[PDB]
Amino acid sequence: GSKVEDPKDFPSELLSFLSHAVFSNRTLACFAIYTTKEKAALLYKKIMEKYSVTFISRHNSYNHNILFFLTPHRHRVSAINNYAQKLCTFSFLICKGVNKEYLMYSALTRDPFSVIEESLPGGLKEHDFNP
């Protein structure tokens, strides 16, 4: 248009590692929140001490910020969506289930997708999953 184009979904560069559906009646761990840097900053500290995420990181995409976190406690996808959707009083929110954690992080660490802050010392590893 003439200003910042606000999308309603994730970029094609990450859609390949996403489950797409959020109302999927299944358990998940990896969740990504496409929002504003200010919003992702709040969720960064809130979700961390709310679900005791094993890993949380704020990444820069194109026009917004992507909060990538992995919850150890198993729960339904929609359970997280309801919580995130609730905090959309000052900014939008695109939270969807991640199909491939390590794979998504791999894309979130290349050229356009920059790494701002993260809890783990060097992204995700084999210690967060099961070989």
Partner: protein, 69 residues
């Protein structure tokens, strides 16, 4: 609906229905299900991990669950 094998269904159930706070270790899986070979259990664990039902709490052998309803 149940996109899992009957064999794996029991494996996952044994872990989530375990009265142990540690959940169910790999050494415990083969202990309970003696008819389950290590090779088979490892595959099931990997699948259950991809299914997001189980996870390595503080070790690859230390399996734990939360949601499997």
């Amino acid at each position: 609906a149940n996109g899992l094998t009957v064999a794996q269904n029991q494996v996952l159930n044994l872990i989530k229905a375990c009265p142990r706070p540690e959940g169910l270790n790999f050494q415990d899986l083969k202990n309970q299900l003696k008819h389950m070979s290590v090779s088979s259990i490892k595959q099931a664990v990997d699948f259950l991990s991809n299914e997001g039902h189980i996870y390595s709490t503080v070790d690859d052998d230390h399996f734990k669950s939360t949601d499997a309803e």
